[PDB]
Structure formats: structure tokens, C-alpha cells
Amino acid sequence: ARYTTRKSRRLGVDYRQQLQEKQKARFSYGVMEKQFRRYYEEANRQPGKTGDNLLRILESRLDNVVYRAGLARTRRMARQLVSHGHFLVNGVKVDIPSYRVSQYDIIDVKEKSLNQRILVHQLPERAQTEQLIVELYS
Amino acid sequence: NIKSQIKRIRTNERRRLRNQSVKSSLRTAIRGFREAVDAGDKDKASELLHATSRKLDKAASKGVIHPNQAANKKSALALALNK
Amino acid sequence: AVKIKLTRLGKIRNPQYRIIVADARTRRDGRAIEVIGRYPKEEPSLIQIDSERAQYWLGVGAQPTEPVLALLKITGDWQKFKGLPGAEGTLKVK
Amino acid sequence: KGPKYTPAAPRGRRKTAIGYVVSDKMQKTIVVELEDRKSHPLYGKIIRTTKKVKAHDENGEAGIGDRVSLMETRPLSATKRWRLVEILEKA
RNA sequence: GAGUGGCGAACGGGUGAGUAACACGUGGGUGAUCUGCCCUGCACUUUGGGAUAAGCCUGGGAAACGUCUAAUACCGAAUACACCCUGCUGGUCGCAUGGCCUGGUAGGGGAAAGCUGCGGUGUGGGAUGGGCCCGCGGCCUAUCAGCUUGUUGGUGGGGUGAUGGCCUACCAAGGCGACGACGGGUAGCCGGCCUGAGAGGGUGACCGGCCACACUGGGACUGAGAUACGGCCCAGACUCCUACGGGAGGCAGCAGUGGGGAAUAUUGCACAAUGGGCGCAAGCCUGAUGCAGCGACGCCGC
Ligand SMILES: [Mg+2]
Ligand SMILES: [Mg+2]
Ligand SMILES: [Mg+2]
Ligand SMILES: [Mg+2]
Ligand SMILES: [Mg+2]
Ligand SMILES: [Mg+2]
Ligand SMILES: [Mg+2]
Ligand SMILES: [Mg+2]
Ligand SMILES: [Mg+2]
Ligand SMILES: [Mg+2]
């Protein structure tokens, strides 16, 4: 399931307020609600701030990296690139947007794919809103 | 049926009639001992112990009676003979 | 009587065995007396065995099964027990 | 070369019990009452429980109201699992 | 090919009827006991005989179940000092019967198999599996208050692998119960699994232990081991074949079929892999098992 401007238009930033920040956080990264539920339940298991771990897990996604990398414009543009398998990780075809890259992960591009290989130094802290989404659940 | 059960039925007729014969022969040996003891007949009963205790432990050597059973018979006959 | 087996603990098309001492009577994934070692989906097969416990159970008279007897002959606990001059030195990983 | 014989190569303890004698009227068997105390799993009262335990006397030494030390056995008879070791106090 | 013979067939797999019990779960005990196969000490594998299937000829019927010849089949003996039984006696250990030192004695007895490298009897030890007792633990009910006579104990015998009223014959008059005996109802038990912050409450699917049962009941035989699923005998209930004289069979194995249900699968492929049985081995069996099909039934991922 992939969702496939207005959905953003309702929220702005293009229980009343609680759901709206989750909604942009979900439809920004292109996640389905069941997958977003899983990253929360992993985040609260991990130590530190439970809200701050959530944004670390969502930023770790391999397609998110492409968006930040800027190899492909529009996070939704990178969905078309990644699943098609243009990208490579440690000499392996990742055809998966849900791949979460760790530290020392080498993302290269496949030969051809003609329409620049940046590396992960660590999983970025929040400095590189969560307390609504934490208080939404539980 | 259908199986090699048909063969192992034929064995259990054969091997029963062997073990039935030996088990029955021990009973008549042990029975005739006690009638000698209850008469007050010492010299006859002393002979019949060595007759029976021979025959008991041979049946253990067959693999019929099992030696612990054969031993506990011989114990009972000897303690009877002493009195 | 007692026998050194393998027991298939893996998921589908991906077996992992652990080298188990057990009775001949028991079902394949049943109760072991002792788990000695472990062991095929690799360029180099992964084989690990306690050398001390293998000598104990073989010294008692635990009969190895046919494919375990290969693994003992490879790692060289069979040649310690048997006392024949082929010795030991095999495996690696990478 | 081998020796024609090998060594066999000990002795776990049976349980003990002490308790006051009741009804020593049956052919050398003494019916001893053993007190036990356990905390009740929920409520946490220490309940005093009891049970009658048929001990083998042999010769009829002890009497009623005596505090007799015991030890376990095989079944000497069905119910009878015990024997007296030593007789403390008297009636 | 079939036939005698040796091992296997008690394992694997199924289902939850029964059972409120030493059945189960955790603890111990066994001076109260068994153990084929396996290995690893020691000592031997001596000597003779008698039969019986197969094969031929008879009867019986649609069907199916009188005379000959071999063996690691079955049997008289001899030898065995380990071993079993009894008598007299030594020392030590202690938890009472008693154990142990192969204690030492002197009486009486115990076995076997051979043919093209595998075996065979006896007896020490080790390992496996069991069996039998007990401590405590775990559902509802007094609109169930008395129950018991082999009942509780003793002595002499029988019996079992083994201790025991386990059984049996005589004396004693005891046992269990308000801490729920004897009854009625429901129930496989557990590691776990769902929930809850916990303590609790519910449930016992898959996966892994132990129990019970194999149309319904009652037996025993063979064996190292039997609730003996695909064994035997008898009695009952039910259903098939029949040329009406006679027979045969039990999916709670895997598929499958019809019912009942709101509802649950293919009359699949293969012994390649792991486990098991037999054989010296090559191998030969394995609906265990490894896989495939089918159903969004569930959990993930695109
Ligand atoms: Mg006796
Ligand atoms: Mg009841
Ligand atoms: Mg046998
Ligand atoms: Mg029921
Ligand atoms: Mg609460
Ligand atoms: Mg029946
Ligand atoms: Mg028998
Ligand atoms: Mg069947
Ligand atoms: Mg059978
Ligand atoms: Mg079926």
C-alpha cells in the first residue's frame, strides 16, 4: 500500500490537534498507519526520550535518505527510484523503501540509471512535534 | 491383517506350547515336594529338593521363568526342608 | 541404545541442526540427554562441537548416526576416540 | 591383563518427623500427629495444619502423649510408611 | 517368488472419550527393584540325538483356510567356581529391617551356533530407558454427615522384576472425617498462551513433556519391554461378500467420502535432506519427515 496537495492543505504546513501532527508526519514520509504504529512501539522500548527516538527511526528510512540526499526531488519521486532498484547498499540491491540504514552504511547507485555517493556517519539526533504523538497513544 | 502378523501368530502357538510344558513340569515337581514334607518324610524330601532346585534353575536358563523367580522358589523349598 | 543425532530447528528451506545425544526411540525433535554441539547452508559449513563431551559419550558407547560420523571425522573427535593416526585440523570459517 | 572384577563405586537421606502420639492401639504401630505451618498464598495467615501418620513401633515402647522422632521407610503395610527412631519425653 | 528361522512389529503417528487419581506439576526415596540392542573388562564356544513346515497325493468350496527332507529352529548330557540356594562363622558401615568386603569357608546346581570378515552363551562394570512409594501444590458443591469388614494392623504361607491385604487362612478391633470423609457435577494435566502496572482472571490451539484410550466390554499369550491402532481369544452392537455350504472387516495413520455444523484443505510429489528398523555391506521399506497445492484464516513486506 502506497497512498498514491490537498491532504496537506487540511493540516496547513504544506484530540483535535493531536491527530493533525501525526497526519503530516505520516503523509510526509509516506508511511501506512500500521507501519507508523510499529515504529512508535519500537521507539518506547529504546532508552532516552521516547518521542525523540521516533523521529530518529523515521529519518533512518532508506527512501528518506534519498530525499535528504536530494538524488531525487520530492520524497514521492524517490519511491519510484528505490523500488525499481536503482540504488545499492553495501553491494546489494535494496528494492525496499522501509530499509532503515544504520551507521557505516554505503549507499551507491547502480550502473546506468541515467536521468555522488554520500555516507552515513551516525543516526542523526532530533536537532538534525514528538510530544503530541507520544501523548496521542497510550 | 495382511502383514507378517500371520507368521508371528504361528510362532505364538509354537512358543506357548514350549513354555506351558516347562511351567507345568515345575508345578508337579514343587507339588510332589510339599506332600513329602507334610508326611514327615525327611530322606525323601531332602532328595526332592535337589531334584526340584536343579529343574527350577534350568527353566531360568531357558529364558522362561526369569532367574529372580527361580531363586525365590529355591529359597522357599530349602527353608521348608530345614524344619 | 544412546545415539548422537541431528535435530532440525530451522525455518522452511533453511535448516539449522544441533548435535543432540538421545535414545534411538525418541522422536526427532524430542528430549535430549545432552546437547553437545551444532551444525549446512554456507559456503563453509558451520560446525561446532564440545571435544570433551564427545569423548565422554563415545567412550560410554553412544553410536553416531551416519551423517554425524562425517562431522566427527572432519573435526577429529572420532580420531581421538578411535586412536588412529589421521589426527585433527579442519573447518575454519573465514 | 584385566582384573576379572571391578568396583561398584552413596546413600541419600530419608526425611524425618517429630510429633505427639495418638491412639497407639494397633499391634506395634503408633499413629503420630505431625504439625505443619505454611503461610496461606493470598491472605498470609500462618495456618496450623495437622495430619495422622502411621509409624511402625516394634515391641510397643512409646505411649499416648509421647513426642516420638520418626523416619521414612518402604511400605511395611498400606498406609504405614514410617518407623520410630527415638523416644523423647513420656506420658 | 512363496516357506521355516532371526530381529523389528511396545518405537514413530493419531485423537481427548475416560480419570478430581501419585493421573499431572515440582521435590526427594529405591538397604524394595528390572533393562534387548549399544561398548569393554574376564572366561569359554565341549558332545550327541529326535522332529517339522516347504515339496507330493487326498477330501472341502463361489471365495479363503495322508506319506517325506534341512538350520544360528527345538532338545539328554558334560564343563563354569564368576553366578543362584541353604548351613556354620570373620570384620566393618548405620538410619531399623539390613547393607557391603566378588569376605572366608563345604554342601547342591546352573550355559552356547555356526558360514564367508560378522556372530554365539555366562558374569563384573558403565550408559540408557523404565517400574514402585511418599512431602507439598493445583476447580464447583453440605439443597451431600456419616463412611469402611480385606476394611486398619499382626503372624505364618502363596505371589511379583520388586516392597506391599497384592492375594489367602487364623487371632486382634481398629481405620478415615468439619483441616470437608463417603457422594453428585464438570475436567486430560503442564511448559506455556491471551490480558493486567501488579496481584489476579481466562484458556490448554500450533510447538515440547507426562497420562489415558484404539467399535463396546472382559482376558491372557509371545517377549528384554504390551492400553499389544494397521495382533490373538471370547462376548455384545453394527455393516459387507455369498453359487446360502461358508467367510471377512473397524481411518480417534495420511489423503478422501457422506453426514452434523456459522465454519476448516489435495483420493499431491519424493525418500535428495534429518530421525528410525533390518542387513557384513551394496541396499530395501518409512503418508514419520522434507516439500507442493488450496483458503486474506493470521502476522509482516512491496
Ligand atoms: Mg517367597
Ligand atoms: Mg468425582
Ligand atoms: Mg530379543
Ligand atoms: Mg471429558
Ligand atoms: Mg486493575
Ligand atoms: Mg476395546
Ligand atoms: Mg513372559
Ligand atoms: Mg487403523
Ligand atoms: Mg501391532
Ligand atoms: Mg483422515
Q: Which three cell numbers stand for residue B75?
A: 529359597
Where b means 16+ CB within 10 Å and e means fewer, B53-82 reads bebbeebbeeebbeeeebeebbeebeeebe
**How are beta strands C63-64 and C2-8 bridged, if at all?**
parallel
Nucleotide nearest to D77 (CA to C1'): E164
Subset of residues 42-101 in chain A with CB less than 7 angstroms from any atom in strand E: 83, 96-98
Cell numbers at C14, concatenated: 533453511
- Cβ atoms of C46 and C74 within 8 Å: the answer is no
Extents of the domains making up chain C: 1-94
Task: Tell me the one-letter amino acid at A46.
Answer: Q
CATH number at residue D39: 2.40.50.140
For chain A, the domain total comes to: 2
Residue C61: partners with Cβ closer than 8 Å, 6 or more residues away: C1, C2
Q: Which ligand gives the minimal distance to the CA of B63?
A: 7
Q: Which three cell numbers stand for residue A2?
A: 502506497
The domain that holds B1 is classified in CATH as 1.20.58.110
Type and span of the H or E element at A41: helix A33-43
What is the count of structural domains for chain B? Answer: 1
Residues in CB range of B30: below 8 A, 6 or more apart: B52, B73, B77
Helical segments of D1-91, H only:
none
Distance CA A16, CA A7 (A): 16
Elucidation method: cryo-EM
Are A86 and A52 in the same domain? no
Range of the domain at A9: 1-60+129-138
Cα C61 to Cα C32, C54, C55, C87, D60, distances in angstroms: 16, 11, 10, 21, 54
In the 17-76 stretch of chain D, whose C-beta falls under 7 Å of nucleic acid strand E?
23, 25-29, 31, 36, 38, 41-42, 48-52, 54, 56, 58, 71-76
Phi, psi of D22 (to 5 degrees): -140, 140
d(CA B36, CA B42): 8
The total domain count for chain D is 1
Rounded CA separation C27/C44 (Å): 29
Q: Which ligand is nearest to the CA of B78?
A: 1
Residue A6: Cβ within 10 Å count: 7
Cα angle vertex A76, ends A73, A77, to 5°?
45
Is there contact between B34 and strand E, defined as CB under 7 Å from any strand atom?
A: no
B5 touches strand E (CB under 7 A): yes
Subunits that touch chain A (at least 3 Cβ pairs < 8 angstroms)? none
D63: left (phi over 0), alpha (psi -120 to 50) or beta: beta
Distance B46 CA to ligand 3 centre (A): 37
CA angle, A126 then A128 then A133, to 5°: 30
- Biggest CA–CA distance in chain B, Å, is 60
Neighbours of ion ligand 1 (CB under 5 A): B 72, 76
The three-class DSSP label of residue A107 is strand
Beta-bridged to residue C85, according to DSSP, are: none
Q: How many helices (H) and strands (E) does chain B have?
A: 3, 0
- The set of cell numbers assigned to A118 is 554520500
CA angle A20, A102, C16 (to 5 degrees): 115
User: Which three three-digit cell numbers place residue A108?
Assistant: 551507491
Tell me, in angstroms, the distance from the centre of ligand 6 to residue B34's CA: 42
